[PDB]
């Protein structure tokens with residue numbers, strides 16, 4: 001659930017989901033359209049796509065359980081949705097951590113009209 005994802009984000013990046021990644025680029029936080037502005041934005045695009053593979057699940061609200069083995073993220077067994085949701089978020093966190101070096105504040109609160117074009121998952 002959104003509640004777990006943000007905590008995962010924070011642990012991973014030292015940054016707070018809101019407002020650091022809640023309105024970043026064209027896909028972080030609301031997704032929809034356009035060309036991902038950068039690596040961080042790309043993580044969100046993939047992440048939206050990931051959630052997209054689970055039409056019959058509820059990513060924002062279904063809670064899952066996970067643990068850290070030394071500093072690794074390990075999703076604990078739950079319902080199938082729960083397991084695939086977790087794998088989706090885990091990927092996004094690692095991705096964020098992997099591009100923190102190019103995170104740019106000029107993409108915070110990015111305006112909608114500056115996101116043109118569809119991109120397929």
Ligand SMILES: O=C(O)Cc1ccccc1Nc1c(Cl)cccc1Cl
Nearest residue numbers: 002005006017021028029030044047
């Ligand atoms: O992919 C992301 O960076 C995050 C993301 C994607 C889809 C929907 C919500 C969020 N984030 C989000 C979070 Cl992480 C907390 C509170 C409110 C919102 Cl809208």
